[PDB]
Write a protein that binds this ligand. Structure first.
Ligand code: 7QZ
Length: 113
């Protein structure tokens, strides 16, 4: 099915996002932001739907995403939360932009038929 194939591409993109070659900028997105350990007392107030790569991985496996668009929405939610909460000069934002570039360039090759 077109959907099965799209999901495989999504699985491949997320696997690449976890790969050692991208770890220097991907690592802060591997798991949910630990608001307690980082002392981000206002994070929950500011961000309504936290998202991270391990959460996306778990959702893909459980077959939560019906298609590439649903999967893409959660990847873009992860980056948007970073752009929303952090000051634009924060290092983590620079890292988000590098990981988003890897994501967008490969997600743009999604099979179209
Ligand atoms: C998506 N996301 C993720 C994180 C984040 C998560 C971590 N680990 S984790 O367990 O949570 C998730 C996991 F496992 F995947 F890695 C660590 C461990 C160390 N750090 C540093 C040293 C740091 C600095 C620069 C670049 C990268 N890492 C750190 C320490 C203190 C304060 C900031 N940064 C982390 C940062 C923070 C956000 N935002 C943010 O830290 N904002 C902020 C902090 C202080 C002042 C102003 C701010 F805007 C955010 O969005």
């Amino acid at each position: 099915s077109k959907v099965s194939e799209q999901l495989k591409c999504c699985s491949g993109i997320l696997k690449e996002m976890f790969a050692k070659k991208h770890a220097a900028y991907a690592w802060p997105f591997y798991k949910p932001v630990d608001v307690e350990a980082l002392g981000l007392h206002d994070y929950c107030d500011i961000i309504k739907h936290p998202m991270d790569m391990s959460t996306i991985k778990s959702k893909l496996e459980a077959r939560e995403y019906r298609d590439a668009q649903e999967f893409g929405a959660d990847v873009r939610l992860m980056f948007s939360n970073c752009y929303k909460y952090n000051p634009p000069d924060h290092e983590v934002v620079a890292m988000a932009r590098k990981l988003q570039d890897v994501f967008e360039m490969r997600f743009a090759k999604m099979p179209d038929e």
